[PDB]
Write an enzyme that holds these catalytic residues in place. Structure first.
Site, PDB file in Angstrom:
ATOM      1  CB  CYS A  42      -0.997  -0.031   1.156  1.00  0.00           C
ATOM      2  SG  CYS A  42      -0.208  -0.340   2.758  1.00  0.00           S
TER       3      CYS A  42
ATOM      4  CG  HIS B  82      -0.078   2.238   7.649  1.00  0.00           C
ATOM      5  ND1 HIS B  82      -1.156   1.410   7.906  1.00  0.00           N
ATOM      6  CD2 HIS B  82       0.456   1.842   6.472  1.00  0.00           C
ATOM      7  CE1 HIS B  82      -1.255   0.530   6.923  1.00  0.00           C
ATOM      8  NE2 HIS B  82      -0.297   0.776   6.023  1.00  0.00           N
TER       9      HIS B  82
HETATM   10  N1  LIG Z   1      -3.872  -2.280   4.352  1.00  0.00           N
HETATM   11  C1  LIG Z   1      -3.887  -3.595   4.201  1.00  0.00           C
HETATM   12  O1  LIG Z   1      -4.557  -4.342   4.954  1.00  0.00           O
HETATM   13  C2  LIG Z   1      -2.980  -4.148   3.131  1.00  0.00           C
HETATM   14  C3  LIG Z   1      -2.620  -3.295   2.084  1.00  0.00           C
HETATM   15  C4  LIG Z   1      -1.774  -3.744   1.087  1.00  0.00           C
HETATM   16  C5  LIG Z   1      -1.307  -5.048   1.117  1.00  0.00           C
HETATM   17  N2  LIG Z   1      -1.667  -5.895   2.138  1.00  0.00           N
HETATM   18  C6  LIG Z   1      -1.146  -7.263   2.128  1.00  0.00           C
HETATM   19  O2  LIG Z   1      -2.163  -8.129   1.653  1.00  0.00           O
HETATM   20  C7  LIG Z   1      -2.051  -9.398   2.348  1.00  0.00           C
HETATM   21  C8  LIG Z   1      -3.319  -9.687   3.111  1.00  0.00           C
HETATM   22  O3  LIG Z   1      -3.469  -8.743   4.204  1.00  0.00           O
HETATM   23  P1  LIG Z   1      -4.903  -8.504   4.876  1.00  0.00           P
HETATM   24  O4  LIG Z   1      -4.898  -7.181   5.599  1.00  0.00           O
HETATM   25  O5  LIG Z   1      -6.017  -8.786   3.918  1.00  0.00           O
HETATM   26  O6  LIG Z   1      -4.850  -9.726   5.905  1.00  0.00           O
HETATM   27  P2  LIG Z   1      -6.104 -10.474   6.574  1.00  0.00           P
HETATM   28  O7  LIG Z   1      -5.601 -11.124   7.801  1.00  0.00           O
HETATM   29  O8  LIG Z   1      -7.235  -9.516   6.715  1.00  0.00           O
HETATM   30  O9  LIG Z   1      -6.565 -11.552   5.505  1.00  0.00           O
HETATM   31  C9  LIG Z   1      -5.888 -12.794   5.289  1.00  0.00           C
HETATM   32  C10 LIG Z   1      -6.919 -13.842   4.983  1.00  0.00           C
HETATM   33  O10 LIG Z   1      -6.243 -15.065   4.583  1.00  0.00           O
HETATM   34  C11 LIG Z   1      -6.779 -16.157   5.301  1.00  0.00           C
HETATM   35  N3  LIG Z   1      -5.729 -17.163   5.406  1.00  0.00           N
HETATM   36  C12 LIG Z   1      -4.619 -17.199   6.219  1.00  0.00           C
HETATM   37  N4  LIG Z   1      -3.812 -18.205   5.947  1.00  0.00           N
HETATM   38  C13 LIG Z   1      -4.419 -18.855   4.884  1.00  0.00           C
HETATM   39  C14 LIG Z   1      -4.071 -19.995   4.130  1.00  0.00           C
HETATM   40  N5  LIG Z   1      -2.983 -20.726   4.345  1.00  0.00           N
HETATM   41  N6  LIG Z   1      -4.897 -20.351   3.118  1.00  0.00           N
HETATM   42  C15 LIG Z   1      -5.995 -19.621   2.897  1.00  0.00           C
HETATM   43  N7  LIG Z   1      -6.418 -18.534   3.542  1.00  0.00           N
HETATM   44  C16 LIG Z   1      -5.586 -18.209   4.535  1.00  0.00           C
HETATM   45  C17 LIG Z   1      -7.286 -15.574   6.606  1.00  0.00           C
HETATM   46  O11 LIG Z   1      -8.276 -16.464   7.080  1.00  0.00           O
HETATM   47  C18 LIG Z   1      -7.829 -14.215   6.154  1.00  0.00           C
HETATM   48  O12 LIG Z   1      -9.197 -14.305   5.772  1.00  0.00           O
HETATM   49  C19 LIG Z   1      -0.760  -9.305   3.181  1.00  0.00           C
HETATM   50  O13 LIG Z   1       0.352  -9.780   2.427  1.00  0.00           O
HETATM   51  C20 LIG Z   1      -0.665  -7.808   3.473  1.00  0.00           C
HETATM   52  O14 LIG Z   1       0.659  -7.331   3.711  1.00  0.00           O
HETATM   53  C21 LIG Z   1      -2.499  -5.458   3.149  1.00  0.00           C
HETATM   54  O1  LIG Z   2      -1.277  -1.809   4.939  1.00  0.00           O
HETATM   55  C1  LIG Z   2      -0.690  -2.756   4.493  1.00  0.00           C
HETATM   56  C2  LIG Z   2       0.625  -2.545   3.741  1.00  0.00           C
HETATM   57  O2  LIG Z   2       0.723  -3.191   2.493  1.00  0.00           O
HETATM   58  C3  LIG Z   2       1.713  -2.951   4.701  1.00  0.00           C
HETATM   59  O3  LIG Z   2       2.106  -1.620   5.054  1.00  0.00           O
HETATM   60  P1  LIG Z   2       3.423  -1.022   4.365  1.00  0.00           P
HETATM   61  O4  LIG Z   2       3.039  -0.814   2.880  1.00  0.00           O
HETATM   62  O5  LIG Z   2       3.745   0.273   5.139  1.00  0.00           O
HETATM   63  O6  LIG Z   2       4.471  -2.120   4.626  1.00  0.00           O
END
Ligand SMILES: NC(=O)c1ccc[n+]([C@@H]2O[C@H](COP(=O)([O-])OP(=O)(O)OC[C@H]3O[C@@H](n4cnc5c(N)ncnc54)[C@H](O)[C@@H]3O)[C@@H](O)[C@H]2O)c1
Ligand SMILES: O=C[C@H](O)COP(=O)(O)O
Ligand SMILES: NC(=O)c1ccc[n+]([C@@H]2O[C@H](COP(=O)([O-])OP(=O)(O)OC[C@H]3O[C@@H](n4cnc5c(N)ncnc54)[C@H](O)[C@@H]3O)[C@@H](O)[C@H]2O)c1
Ligand SMILES: NC(=O)c1ccc[n+]([C@@H]2O[C@H](COP(=O)([O-])OP(=O)(O)OC[C@H]3O[C@@H](n4cnc5c(N)ncnc54)[C@H](O)[C@@H]3O)[C@@H](O)[C@H]2O)c1
Ligand SMILES: NC(=O)c1ccc[n+]([C@@H]2O[C@H](COP(=O)([O-])OP(=O)(O)OC[C@H]3O[C@@H](n4cnc5c(N)ncnc54)[C@H](O)[C@@H]3O)[C@@H](O)[C@H]2O)c1
Ligand SMILES: O=C[C@H](O)COP(=O)(O)O
Ligand SMILES: O=C[C@H](O)COP(=O)(O)O
Ligand SMILES: O=C[C@H](O)COP(=O)(O)O
Lengths: 334, 335, 334, 334
Positions: A152, A179
């Site tokens: 992000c 953040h």
């Molecule tokens: N702001 C954000 O939340 C954000 C922004 C950009 C990128 N990301 C990235 O995106 C990814 C997901 O983050 P998120 O915030 O959605 O996390 P989250 O915890 O909300 O979602 C993860 C999901 O995956 C499921 N899960 C976990 N292990 C699993 C497996 N082995 N098989 C299948 N499902 C499984 C969980 O049950 C959950 O529903 C991460 O790599 C994170 O860094 C997050």
């Molecule tokens: O919010 C989720 C991001 O992808 C993890 O934060 P970051 O971009 O600062 O590492």
């Protein structure tokens, strides 16, 4: 119509599902995998503490969830080895569990029948990393099969850094992203490999890492060695700001820094990078589709030191960037 | 000195550690088990988002954490049978992981050499269940070896219910606890066995179950079938209020209801149940040692329908109650 | 087109304006009064921490705000005696300052040219009090000129209490509303006439008074003397629940309590009272247009004692009820 | 015993009162002024959402509050010229309303009988400005009669900036403070002079100004023209962090930056500036008595660009700084 699978139906997975449904004319999600039952997963799809209620009908049974009359297959396989994407003629898988950011693990989706995997995160061992609007033109549809859509914060920083570096020359810069908390943090003080993310997320300012500033250099190689930074996680559920302080040899003022962004933030790129002179707070940028929303009122200049600040909805903004990347992949071969 | 072990050094485990250190003259915690390394565990001991910094020096090594010069052995065993409580002369184990609330799973501690287990939650298959101040005089040192200290909410409700039931007779009552979020809930919307506890805890009013509902009948059998209720989890990190609306055949007023509590909340029992006429908000009862803090300003009466409200720090309050129960167990025979 | 003015362009005033835009075809807000300048007031209209960005174009000058091309006169008059509603041909004034709930003060709007005043709160000395869907058929267009739309909590409780009283007979009931913080509470501990509402709203459960339980008797006089209760203000920015525990002589079960609401929650009354079997949390009812959203999952019965719980968006839901009342007054002689 | 009056018995006023009780053996608060009655003000003194219950007995009557047996006169004069500080033999007035930062208005305290006024904020037209530990040695008891103890942020930034400028040299720097919300922000979106501080404080990241980095130049004139910055207010009730990014005159490493602070943070100065290698979050520095808690783990360096972060309890830490300054005034003439 290109068929998409989602592995990890979490914040990003469900943001992505709704982004597809709401924004795309040419993609449909036809299968998803998580770790729960269909009653639970449909409930979380239907009701969202951030996005509000889904405005379509959602039903489920022991095999599937049905959204607006379209049946979605659901799995609960911890190990992607046990999935079969080809059984649903799935072209592209979004890898959004947070557990398969290693492309050598994520490639199991391809062994399981998909043609392309997009990791919703900084990856290791990936074929390529992309920030839409910054370096997507170097996508190679023959050789780029397991790719990253970066983080992000990277999708916020890189568009701004590109414009300012191209115009003036960034010598070095250090970033702080203020953040929203994320699900990696604990609700109550509890063990975490990061001793600060261990701490109650909704009552703390929590310093922690971000690979965003060096990841920026993955998509803008000219900035290698020139950026570093960290995060302060704070108690808002979504909505974030990236604050970059950099030096330049160029002669600059507040007004000319801001003009450089305004001049660039147009056309297709302006879907990635917006320019604002509004009195913004974080709630104003929740559900904004941009990767980066430059806040001209926060620009400061002292000598050859510049501070600039850009907002981003770390859920929806990032998701919309990921959908732009997904659309490109889908527009080309396999 | 009776020596105590803690299994599950979480919110309640660490609260318990601090309460013993701060409040007891005759117990010492000498061994702890969790699932993490000593660097992590000792960080969470030294620094607390609710209770503040521990006022004593905290060091660690590969086998221990040292607090104020006192060495605590530490383990990282998911299975309590891989522990040895007897080796550290531990008589009483606090079972506060949340995973061994079945007494026939918690008895793994006894297997590992403990003489007494106190589960920090409602239990199944347990020898007995206690709310200190309410029914602890029923403790049987020979027969009650794996016991429950009930829940925070039960420890709030039962003192109040006993005083009121004894004086006026509760026909039936229904309770709502407006309750701080706990670590069982999700920070972001995510899967959970309870579809409402699945929802982002710090931006939601979250309806869900409470222990207290039926469990009061374990410590007050005369109210079996007469009480029920639920919880609204709300965005505060600790601090809760139990709101009980009941019928009585007695002719009562706000004044007589309040007077019953004030006359009971004295002496030892006064350490469990307090009476306040202060303009209390939740932050005023954080770190209060009482199980139940009756708020006389919130009493309401309409015909034969009565509403009473009592506060509790669902962490510290409950913890002080558990410490009282532990003290009692430590004061009697450990065979 | 019936022309409306808003005195007190605050949370409820601005909700009301949006609600008119979104939901009415015969009302137009033509003038507003507050205590600020037009740059500030237009900014608050445009950007909202709860409702998000207004979709219309907003401009201002020294005596107006223009919204979607429609010019709205703005006043800044602390004393309503100094207003002239007749200058802009205003029919109905919404009194939503908080400071003129005594109808003897609010009738200043009439002397200033208005034909009807609707006080957005429990009033004193008023001509009539209404909860739409409960007792709006008693509205008398000749004799009801300064009226009350009651409180948010009253609009939640009264619909539910009417149905349960009609079906089962409420002997006596006591209510607790677990209620979002409102603007008259304090961000930091600070002076307030109420010693608890003085305390930092976003970190406390704050007990306080509510007249709703005795205001219900104004709209359902058969419940005079038979209801009372109080509020707990908690750290959510909007979204509230009314928890009512009552005694009945009726033989009842959870099932029969729930069935009574479901049966009633239909047709026009159903736009006031909804019935839900969903796993609701407070974010789920933000921006819901009902006065009352009964939660069938939370119903409990012990002997002759019954506990029921209904949700409300204390901003939007209440406002939609106030707009329904406004629409009725607008439909008759003025 | 030197006798102190407090004008504005708010967050900072009441922190000061507690700090006096806990930390002073030679000062006594004997009168206060606010805009409220004594039932309300005594309640706020007794019960504190941040600091907890006062361990002294508190009573009140219609012109006083009594604490631990000591009677404190209470006034309710909006206008300082209507006060009489001589009535109660007051030496030093803490001016902590927020409304009298102009020394030409604050001097009304001197006309009302006081000998010295300490303004709990950056001032205008003042005799001098002090950050204890940085420039208090320049205090002139003859000529410095209406003085400023600067801001929370200044007391955090200036000690750290002194050491890093002394050892490495600051060419220019730009700061961001991530700061707890304060009582001049709005709980719900409402009129404010600052259009961002207008916005609901407990759900937003709120960018706003701070003169703090330019006020550093009042206590360290060698840094005039070389610092600027802004604040992001975030939803924690107290606890803040100052993030400074500067260009260094000399080459440095993370380790040498960290060493310099650790070396300086000893002795009396170390009561102002602490050095930490702990995994700190905001709740860890609540009720810390330092003006500045330097966080070694967050130091970063890229080329000649340096980022440093220091914590402060913007209530208690600043108040402890203010009390140090008060003690100094009290130890000398008049
Ligand atoms: N702001 C954000 O939340 C954000 C922004 C950009 C990128 N990301 C990235 O995106 C990814 C997901 O983050 P998120 O915030 O959605 O996390 P989250 O915890 O909300 O979602 C993860 C999901 O995956 C499921 N899960 C976990 N292990 C699993 C497996 N082995 N098989 C299948 N499902 C499984 C969980 O049950 C959950 O529903 C991460 O790599 C994170 O860094 C997050
Ligand atoms: O919010 C989720 C991001 O992808 C993890 O934060 P970051 O971009 O600062 O590492
Ligand atoms: N927090 C409250 O308000 C509260 C109040 C009263 C009772 N309780 C009860 O106390 C128990 C603990 O609750 P909590 O809030 O402290 O939970 P928590 O999540 O804060 O702590 C649980 C701890 O146990 C550790 N753990 C988990 N499995 C383990 C295992 N197999 N072996 C060793 N350590 C293990 C975890 O790492 C964690 O540190 C629960 O039964 C809960 O109902 C909690
Ligand atoms: N949940 C709710 O917010 C809610 C729900 C139902 C009813 N109400 C009632 O609605 C009324 C307004 O409440 P609110 O939440 O909108 O409050 P608010 O503080 O958000 O709004 C009040 C507005 O009136 C303005 N104002 C104050 N005094 C004025 C005066 N003399 N002349 C002109 N404007 C003046 C203020 O500047 C502000 O914009 C109150 O009576 C309240 O009880 C509130
Ligand atoms: N973090 C902080 O809170 C912080 C830190 C450093 C400096 N300051 C400064 O200290 C001052 C006070 O800030 P605060 O946070 O205590 O504010 P506050 O709102 O908590 O307190 C101000 C107090 O002054 C009273 N008051 C208002 N006008 C008055 C008048 N005319 N006469 C008498 N009393 C009056 C109010 O009723 C209130 O009790 C401001 O100048 C602020 O910038 C605040
Ligand atoms: O808060 C922790 C309690 O033990 C769980 O709450 P409860 O007593 O309402 O079940
Ligand atoms: O939301 C604000 C209400 O109008 C005032 O509270 P209440 O309805 O619970 O009386
Ligand atoms: O905390 C209150 C300060 O006085 C305001 O913050 P600041 O120091 O960044 O101006």
């Amino acid at each position: 119509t290109i068929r998409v699978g989602i592995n990890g139906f979490g914040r990003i997975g469900r943001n992505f599902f709704r982004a597809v449904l709401e924004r795309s004319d040419d993609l449909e999600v036809v299968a998803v995998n998580d770790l729960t039952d269909n009653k639970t997963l449909s409930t979380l799809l239907k009701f969202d503490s951030i996005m509000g209620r889904l405005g379509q009908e959602v039903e489920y049974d022991d095999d599937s969830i049905t959204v607006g009359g379209k049946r979605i297959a659901v799995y609960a396989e911890r190990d992607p080895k046990n999935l079969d994407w080809a059984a649903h003629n799935v072209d592209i898988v979004i890898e959004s569990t947070g557990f398969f950011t290693d492309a050598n693990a994520a490639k199991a989706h391809i062994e399981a029948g998909a043609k392309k995997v997009i990791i919703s995160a900084p990856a290791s061992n990936e074929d390529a990393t992309f920030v839409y609007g910054v370096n997507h033109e170097s996508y190679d549809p023959e050789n780029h099969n397991v790719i990253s859509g970066a983080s992000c914060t990277t999708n916020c920083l890189a568009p701004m850094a590109k414009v300012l570096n191209d115009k003036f020359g960034i010598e070095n810069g250090l970033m702080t992203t203020v953040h929203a908390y994320t699900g990696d943090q604990r609700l109550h003080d509890a063990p975490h490999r990061d001793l600060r993310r261990a701490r109650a997320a909704a009552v703390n300012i929590v310093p922690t890492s971000t690979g965003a500033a060096k990841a920026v250099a993955l998509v803008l190689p000219e900035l290698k060695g020139k950026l570093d930074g960290y995060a302060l996680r704070v108690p808002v559920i979504t909505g974030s700001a990236t604050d970059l302080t950099f030096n330049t040899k160029s002669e600059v003022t507040v007004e000319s820094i801001n003009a450089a962004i305004k001049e660039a933030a147009v056309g297709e790129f302006g879907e990635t990078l917006a320019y604002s002179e509004e009195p913004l707070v974080s709630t104003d940028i929740v559900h904004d589709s941009h990767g980066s929303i430059f806040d001209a009122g926060l620009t400061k200049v002292s000598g050859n030191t510049v501070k600039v600040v850009s907002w981003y909805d770390n859920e929806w903004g990032y998701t919309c960037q990921l959908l732009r990347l997904t659309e490109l992949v889908a527009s080309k071969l396999l």
